[model samples]
Target chain A: SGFAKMAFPSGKVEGCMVQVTCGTTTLNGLWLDDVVYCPRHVICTSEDMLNPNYEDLLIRKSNHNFLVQAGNVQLRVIGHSMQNCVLKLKVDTANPKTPKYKFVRIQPGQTFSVLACYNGSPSGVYQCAMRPNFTIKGSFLNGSCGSVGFNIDYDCVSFCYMHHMELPTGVHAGTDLEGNFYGPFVDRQTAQAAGTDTTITVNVLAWLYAAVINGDRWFLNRFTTTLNDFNLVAMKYNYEPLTQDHVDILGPLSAQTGIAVLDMCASLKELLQNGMNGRTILGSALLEDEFTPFDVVAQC
Target chain B: SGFAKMAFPSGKVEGCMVQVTCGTTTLNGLWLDDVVYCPRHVICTSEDMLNPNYEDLLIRKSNHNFLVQAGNVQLRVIGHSMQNCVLKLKVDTANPKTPKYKFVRIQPGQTFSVLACYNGSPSGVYQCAMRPNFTIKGSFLNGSCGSVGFNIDYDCVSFCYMHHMELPTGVHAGTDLEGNFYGPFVDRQTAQAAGTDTTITVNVLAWLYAAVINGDRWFLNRFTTTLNDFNLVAMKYNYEPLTQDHVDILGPLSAQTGIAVLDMCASLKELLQNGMNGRTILGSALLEDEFTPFDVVAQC
Candidate 1:
């Protein structure tokens, strides 16, 4: 008796007859006919609530979170739910006698980017970190973008690393300073011999930083501190990078100190006497092929 | 009768009273009021025949027939009666891998000037030689500008030699490397500390030449040949001195070869590989105190 007759009220449907004409609707940019709404709920779905936007994030999906991307001498950072997110990017661009600093304050859903150039003789690695804007300090992340840890060859360009080895447990594989996540194929030699269509990738930013830092004592010193202090120390050494004055600052310095610009080792020795590290922090970033620490200080 | 004649013929002179006048004349910017032709011949002459203009010449009177000046990285050569002189000057400026040559045909009474520049690191030393136009070859003077003959400290600027020593038997303290009487004092420290107001001079030309030659393999190779071979080699090096280019040809080479531009020792190593007497040459040019044979090869 309930299914025998039905009367539909306005804006209401219960056991009422309705008609929908087959029409056009867009689906993934294609026109589809015979589109109609079905009276059913689809329950199948694949979504994670904990990791929001997991595909494009640097840090974990947590409070005080940070995400980092290193590209072509540039670093991009993204943060989430980071209240008072204060980011600090450090580069050794000051003189050897000083330390340098740079900072950025990221707004909500903001991407804070920095340009970190390498200026050392070979490949220079720069460390980066970020923390909240509170007096409570946070430990900096080491090798955030992954450390390019390897032993530096005296050439200052080629870095040496372990090529192949057998683990004591009988596994046949080689690893570098950081561990098994290093090179799949070793240096230029192994990479070339494999005949694998290889893409030679260079971290230009690392190179620039290294050249600036490890290039010479004066340059290293100049870039290790704040810009103001760098300028001051450069003036003291008569080697400011300001070239527009139509004078070579280093020329007179060389004439005075008798240290040629190309005299890297000797100048480094001289710099060490004045309180700079005998081996720079950059030097320690590299490892040796023999599985030993690179002797950058002694190499000079 | 000859004494009593008191008469003079044209171009032939005797004591004869002529018009008397006092006039002002200038000799080298000095004014003289009582200037007249006094025919005393100044006959107590002490001029050496080997040296044409001894008192006003560039360096001491020498037999090797060459005098050199090294000033601000330029080399000037003055020769003795170098008739029909075909002078050649060479350096590695035309290209990064070759030497370039410049020839000047000097007429009689002309100073056959050659221009050689410093092209090495930490003050490179360049070697040069001159020869007569005849089939018979003449030996180029060794240390004609006076030998700095000494050991170089690690600074690559200061040379080490004896502070003080008694004259050797049959060897006058004045005898220098060229066997010419030279050296009033030797080395900067000895001269300054002695209180003799003596100037411890340097063979600046030798320094420049060394900086040019011994400073790097390129320079060493450029200057190693005999005069004829030197020209040939210099030509091979593609000689050019267009200093305005301001491009260091040697710098690229070091980068390419993984050689240090300021690796004075490596350059010295390459030099000694070709049978050059490192100690003998440097010693001859420097006083014992002012030089210590450089230990150039050992410095590496």
Candidate 2:
């Protein structure tokens, strides 16, 4: 199963089931049913044989002889240059396989498709994850994270694609240059451009990843990259979420570079240049507005 | 002759009446010097002129035919939106033979070219000393000086640009913008843009003007817009000078907006959304190279 974060006391419960019930505990000073259990329902797991954990994220020529089928979950690979990008899917499993696939590259505000190479397979769990790797000779700023993965040591966050039951149009809209910009919404097929709703959606995903990684006790800090809670509390300009002081402190830092900490706190005001009025979701803020809150985007 | 400011209780001289002797006094005393004594020197005078003192600063442009001129020393006319702004500069010009000019608009950022169209010989003084109007149109955003000239309806001070003897060409050396900026040298351009030096200069002018208009005992305060010395301090960022505090107290406003008194005080560090560092003058020990004491401009 995918990684799961707990949301309670450090006690234990036993059962073959994903969640186990703990016995009697007092509730409201009264005896209550003693069943303690995990909150999230199991959606997917990594137990499937074909689905081995991929090593690198930088997509390049495939080396491993394995089969990858079609699915909905997609990894948006950002490359250092245009040609280095890849948007391909692994197909049917073959011994000493001859690689067969078409190339796809995603653009700002665009989404691409991925499919299970073998279409008519048994309805049981199948291998749904595959990793890619690449190399760059020039300026690879944070090569492991942005480009040039698998150089001696691979520096990257793990990426997993959850295959959907229904096949999607092979698209997952990305955001554009403007702060959470949305919709030029055209009649023609330029759907890849970054837009408003797309940005909000991406923020939700990144925040979800953080939530699963760190669990629920990680919300006390002044600022964090977890975009969902931030989206709730940081949107205080028009929507007053928390106490004025809390909003006052965290609101400006949503778009500011990195987490607003010690030295960064001093220069944060400068980076926010505008004021709270300019901030948007996902560490992005409207350039035209007065941003009293956020400054640089993860620059710190 | 250019405007000059002089402090009394000068150095003392012990000598017989055999040569030129400048005497000094220990007590804080007041004296008025006459310009008729020797070489041509312009002295401060409170003698009223024929024209009304531009009362209320022509709140609205509806009465745009007002014309004003000085019969004494030529003083610069400084006010809000004077650049290409519609105005009646002849209404209060007491003299009928002066042939009042109609609604003549002045170009922004342009020095005065000629004093009167009626007189053949051209003579004029530069509108070098002026205060920004705090108020603005549309949204009343509190702490924001509206479109009408906020406290600027009163007198102001002037800084002697002649001290530096030269203005930098760096004002035009901006990125993705027009010639609205100056150099960052020795904090000269940066200071001017921040509005502190300008504030002090205008305040000094107000002080000198008050001494002439009222009496020698007049002292400068920290709130008098009429005498620039009496005004609150300014921030470092010139283009968008208001600080986080400034916005918190005053609400939201732009540089072009007219400012109100209450708005001025409240606009400090409202939410830390600006880049104002060098708000104070150098050598006052208030700020060192890295330790900026004022709020005008600072390193990012």
Candidate 3:
């Protein structure tokens, strides 16, 4: 599902109140007098855990009682938004504009999980895509925090209008080089004035696949955005970089029976014609790579 | 296993050479031509498929080809002795120390795993411990890197020694108000010079349990060091921080059965008496916390 439906389970998660199955390497919930005690770090669980840049939550099954120095203390670890993989901690101690915990959250990695329901039934889990924080202001928070942002778009001859952000600026910010070519612009009106307004809109994955197969860094560079810039732009905008795995799975296909490697596009096109069917191991990997993270790096 | 025998498999790892079975939520070997193409992130072709980290090995299945990324480059992911989880990136691109691929490993969390032979053999895996680096020279690399160091000891009345490092030194580093004094020395010769060498040397876990039970912060401060410095020493001396989970699992036991909270030590002690057998959930929890990490935080 798109991020429109992505949110933490809407309910009170009784961490200590449930009996989960703990395996050999799993954390058995340690319940004691209605409260569970786990170790915070020795000295500076107080400082590190409370750092505005970092945060920890009082998770169940295995949580550390983060003592904030004076021997024993804990920051506010309230919320169900971790979805399941991680819980965010509230940081407020350092010179804050306000005394209460400010808007700092510990962004964790993505997980393939289902909807966790407090009142409604939980949905089956899937790989959750990361979206920009509508909650935290500014583009200052780093790591898992920060780095996510608004969108920008690019137009290739075959396909046009793939989304991106914070691409290199100056000469690149505005474009010019061809007649059918109108270069990069922030809006449609500007784009129309610059070049052809005949927009061939395609989903992000399709556009990326088209460019990847061309194997031309120079082609993309002329466009002012290269496949390599995907990761850098991901850091600026709020999307993931194109992974090598993705590249390896979906890049130029070839096979040879004699003189030189055959393009092998015929075999692939045959499978594609099978209505998402008749895929061999190679073909399956290709499609899975394309759709598996469909929502993740896909344009909204 | 101790760090001595802890090394990556001692043979050439055939990543894409074998045929493997795959399943849903699992990786199936994707064989094409002579090479297999399985998701490096998925795993376990046979029963011997193991994850000593009590975690996944990121085998024939799931794994991201972490591009050293300059366009296309793979860092030296080799070496079992990630003594310094941080590897030295050959910084001599302009200058010169050496021109090798240079080290750099993403030290994942502590794992509970066993020796594995993809040839269909296995070694039993269990809780793995964190230890100091004996390899990566110079304490510079960080993350799972920088925060580790050497030793310091604190002597309480009931026990003679416990290990630690980088205690904030000064007048506070001296003796606490009179009670009974002991050794906070590096070795026995120095121990004798420091205080009572009565030498009731217990295991580090037992020592920590005692101090933790007594809330060592107030007492250790009385004698200069405090319970708080454990995390710092762990970072300085290549040990690990005591987690809140560990503390919560075995903190002082008390109940509300009387005007005075019932100090439920006897019940817990009875479980300990059961030879790792008759423990209530809490009792077993106490001992497990004491030993599961025996090799990890223990004095090696």
Candidate 4:
């Protein structure tokens, strides 16, 4: 029923400065040094006395899943809040140039993360500091889950991505990194498109990088060319199921490249640089193979 | 380092009254009418100001599993606590003699329950009112999980139970009832005990009744006599796998009873009353057929 403004961390601060108005008799409503004062009121005495225990505001051991992402470290909170709390966080990187990381406030199914890899070598440790300020009735910073931050490590790893949907209405058949992925071929009716005047040959790692961007969390764990593995990719990318032919060929193709786990960083590097790393064939670029054909049932 | 006494609900009460001490303050601490008046102190002010939301204290739709037991209903809480709070509970069945149900104050894993079945008719609704009081940094009620109880229903149902474990090391074979469960006959090397001249035959509904007591939860759901259906009972009761002889015979045996869903209420009827309403064959009594046997390998 009054003016509500966002709180910003400012001016040589070791802690957060929040302008929060709580229950009745609101005056200079600000959480200063973890204290919310209601200008000259007796009821305000209790507000100063309330602070959730440090452990109460932490990502307790029972409530966290520590995952390593590309160059980032992620903490997914899988438990409900131990108390109603507000936790502001930061990376203790000692760098002046890197802009601070901010996490969107979340619930049990949520996260806070830090990206520390520079040029693709993050084989080390990291620490995220947590600044938690708690209250019962407060100016709605309305955060949940107690989080004491993390001291963890990360390493860049390899992955296999099934970027099957990279082409639309394309051929149902695709390869792991050794062959064709041709056709904007409308509603592809055949598994093989080389017979058509236009066939497209594609590879795995580049698309693997794309799948990472597209969210194939499984590859982040392990990658194999088994139909079961690529099956994960099929469902992830929301494409038609992998054809037996694609499954059979994906094995041989993945063997030729022997790229079971493509170095996620170097894999993405090729795509980022637009294919200068290999005969352009090593690039993520899709090759439009020339062809000629016609089908009684629409094979073209 | 001090006296830690379990809190008990006493006298006429609309709220909980307990002697708890929090922080560096030693005083009479009782949560009366949802307020904890700390004797001679100001730090106690905020403790009363804190409370988890009613939604937080509830087995929210996102956190509950409503399952119907034989005659009782169950609420298995699968979510972590939304706060460090104390939740005391009871069933409002309008029965003065029935004592209140008390749940052990627990962490993320816990319970509180009621048993209201008399002569086996529980096809109605149940209401468990919850009284929750919360605090931050207080006398160690040290309870976890915010809970405001449940309003649920129950209905009795039939089931087929594999009382295979009713017989011990004597035979590797068992039935869903309708056959033999003999042998304390010590190490009978054969699947059939009739060869030893000591034959004991068992029936299904009686064992099904025993399973209710032994905890065959699946029979509480839809049950069939298929090997797949009974496999669940095998695992739940920790028995060796059902033998093929038993599996094949179990089908015919289960058919004789013509019962896939024996009345849970009518079913428990036979065992509880000593099985007298039948030609005695309708009873849960063990049928002992005199026998004589000895094995070189140790069957007697």
Q: Which is the leading candidate under lDDT?
A: 4
* DockQ for each model: 0.00, 0.01, 0.01, 0.01
lDDT of 2 by residue, A45-157 (tens): 22421232222222332323111211322112122111111122222222121112111222222111111111211101111101111100111010011110000001111
lDDT on C-alpha atoms for all candidate structures: 0.19, 0.19, 0.21, 0.22
Q: Please, what are the lDDT tens digits per residue for candidate 3 over residues B48-70?
A: 32322213343222223221111
Candidate 4 regions off by >4 Å? A1-221, A224-300, B1-144, B153-259, B262-300
Model 4 chain A worst lDDT window (10 residues): A291-300
Taking all chains together, each candidate's TM-score versus the true structure is 0.15, 0.15, 0.17, 0.15
Candidate 2 positional error at A219, Å: 20
Model 1: residue A296 alpha-carbon error in angstroms: 36
Any runs in candidate 3 off by more than 4 Å, and if so which?
A1-300, B1-71, B74-89, B92-128, B131-268, B275-286, B290-300
lDDT, candidate 3, at A167? 20
lDDT of 1 by residue, A46-86 (tens): 23222233233324333222222121232222222211111
lDDT tens per residue, model 4, B138-208: 10111100111111112111111111111121212111111222223211222423232211112233334
Scored by lDDT, model 1 comes in at 0.19
- Docking quality tier of model 2: incorrect
